[PDB]
From Swiss-Prot:
Protein name, entry field: Pancreatic alpha-amylase
Tissue-by-tissue expression: Detected in pancreas (at protein level).
Residue stretches in coiled coil: none
Recorded GO MF terms: alpha-amylase activity; calcium ion binding; chloride ion binding
Annotated site (Transition state stabilizer): D300
Family: Belongs to the glycosyl hydrolase 13 family.
Length: 496
């Protein structure tokens, strides 16, 4: 299940949040493939409720109306075209599957959907699937409000409505079959796996029953017997009766403790320091590496909207964000996901962003295209973190050192640390309030290496800092606490 199904030496996927199918298709060909990215997580491709108040928020896409591939990202033809073109260039597609529920029970009946499908939440009617009152958990939930009221009761967390979202009766074979019908359509089109949204709100056993109905990956692109990659969104920060380990039999799980703790450490909250990262991973109480999908931030918590709270690092905190992403991509733990966002007008009031609902860049509701500037950055308010030199080069760094052990660790007892990956790579960080100048053992072969954070290797030369490694593997590193990017990374492929 726990294999990404990515090509040979590609080790990361990027979340192109709210991107249109046509733009992702181009991106696969012009950037992702040549830069070594393993795949793309796309937003829910199935029809959702069109919410006008507020005006087309990002979260309207987590309120299904049917399973027709018709959204603001494009129609079914465009979706198929994207999967085909991306697959032909070796870049996988993973879809965000919303199968725990349909839309809000208080939503008005009518055809206010992204494809015009009629639906009536009030009478539990979704004819486009079709689903009726018999397919929901209204009679199974025991809370007085019908919604989830207390997370200390594992039963209502699964059988009741997540903040009013109509809850599907996943134990019924009919419902499980309608879900598999949807997912098998996607698999046969060519998708490589799925992100199961709101997995905590589904019984591990019901999920398994559904997965048992799924086909193997399309044999025109994947080896026979390939199973779809599955990563379940389970927010488990401890303290709840439900644990992410209960879902290991179905596939990997999102490790939300990862970004939450990395954030507090890099921000140096509660006296935490980078030197403590020496035993980062399972030692910190995280799930086993082979069951983890990791990330610094996700579409939900980058807007204070999810697990992690105020500690989560995002593109808004550029300097520290690049370091966190850098550390994540260099460290062997888990399978990594890079975030790619869009800017929205943040407006805090009493510590809360009142514009956290704002959807993707648009013209009267029509999502804007991703424009590429001559410096390779994006326009139309798309942030494109995956294109920042410091992040893109670390994505490549991870590919280069794949399989190499964690070694040659160093720390100053504070926030100046370094470590290597076998004899293929080495990275150094300075998060202290003073300069760093020291000769360290890198485990790398003698030679002149280009630092891939401050620059690039361009045929025989480096555009940024250059590092000289001696015969014994030692090299001198100098990082000022005033550096634009307070960290240096060099690897086998950046050697001159
Ligand atoms: C082998 C090679 O490309 N060497 C170049 C050299 O030709 C160029 O004049 C110099 C400019 O700083 O950088 C180095
Ligand atoms: Ca449920
Ligand atoms: Cl996620």
């Amino acid at each position: 299940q726990y294999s990404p199904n990515t090509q040979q030496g590609r080790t990361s996927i990027v979340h192109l949040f709210e991107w249109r199918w046509v733009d992702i298709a181009l991106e696969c060909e012009r950037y992702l493939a040549p830069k070594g990215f393993g795949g793309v997580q796309v937003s829910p491709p199935n029809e959702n409720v069109a919410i006008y108040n507020p005006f087309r928020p990002w979260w309207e896409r987590y309120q299904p109306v049917s399973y027709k591939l018709c959204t603001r990202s494009g129609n079914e033809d465009e979706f198929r075209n994207m999967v085909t073109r991306c697959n032909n260039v070796g870049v996988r597609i993973y879809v965000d599957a919303v199968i725990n529920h349909m839309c809000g029970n208080a939503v008005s009946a009518g055809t206010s959907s992204t494809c015009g499908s009629y639906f009536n939440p009030g009478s539990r009617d979704f004819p486009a699937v079709p689903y009726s009152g018999w397919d929901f958990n209204d009679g199974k939930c025991k809370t007085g409000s019908g919604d989830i009221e207390n997370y200390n009761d594992a039963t209502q967390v699964r059988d009741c409505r997540l903040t009013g979202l109509l809850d599907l009766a996943l134990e019924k074979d009919y419902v499980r079959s309608k879900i598999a019908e949807y997912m098998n359509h996607l698999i046969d089109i060519g998708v490589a796996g799925f992100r199961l949204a709101a997995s905590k709100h589904m019984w591990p056993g019901d999920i398994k029953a559904i997965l048992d109905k799924l086909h193997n990956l399309n044999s025109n692109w994947f080896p026979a017997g390939s199973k779809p990659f599955i990563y379940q969104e389970v927010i488990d920060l401890g303290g709840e009766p439900i644990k992410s380990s209960d879902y290991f039999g179905n596939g990997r799980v999102t490790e939300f403790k990862y970004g939450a703790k990395l954030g507090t450490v890099i921000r140096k909250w509660n006296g935490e320091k980078m030197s403590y990262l020496k035993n980062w991973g399972e030692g910190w109480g995280f799930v086993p590496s082979d069951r983890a999908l990791v990330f610094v931030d996700n579409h939900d918590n980058q807007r204070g909207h999810g697990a992690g709270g105020a500690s989560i690092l995002t593109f808004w905190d550029a300097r520290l964000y690049k370091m966190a992403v850098g550390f994540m991509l260099a460290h062997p733990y888990g399978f990594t996901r890079v975030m790619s966002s869009y800017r929205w007008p943040r407006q805090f009031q009493n510590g809360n962003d009142v514009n956290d609902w704002v959807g993707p860049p648009n013209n009267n509701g029509v999502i804007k295209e991703v424009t590429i500037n001559p410096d390779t950055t994006c326009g139309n308010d798309w942030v494109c973190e995956h294109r920042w030199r410091q992040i893109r080069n670390m994505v490549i760094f991870r590919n280069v050192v794949d399989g190499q052990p964690f070694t040659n660790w160093y720390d100053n007892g504070s926030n100046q640390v370094a470590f290597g990956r076998g004899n293929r790579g080495f990275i150094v960080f300075n998060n202290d309030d003073w300069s760093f100048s020291l000769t360290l053992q890198t485990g790398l072969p003698a030679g002149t290496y280009c630092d891939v954070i401050s620059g690039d290797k361009i045929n025989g030369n480096c555009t940024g800092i250059k590092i000289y490694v001696s015969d014994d593997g030692k090299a001198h590193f100098s990082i000022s606490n005033s550096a634009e990017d307070p960290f240096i990374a060099i690897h086998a492929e950046s050697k001159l």
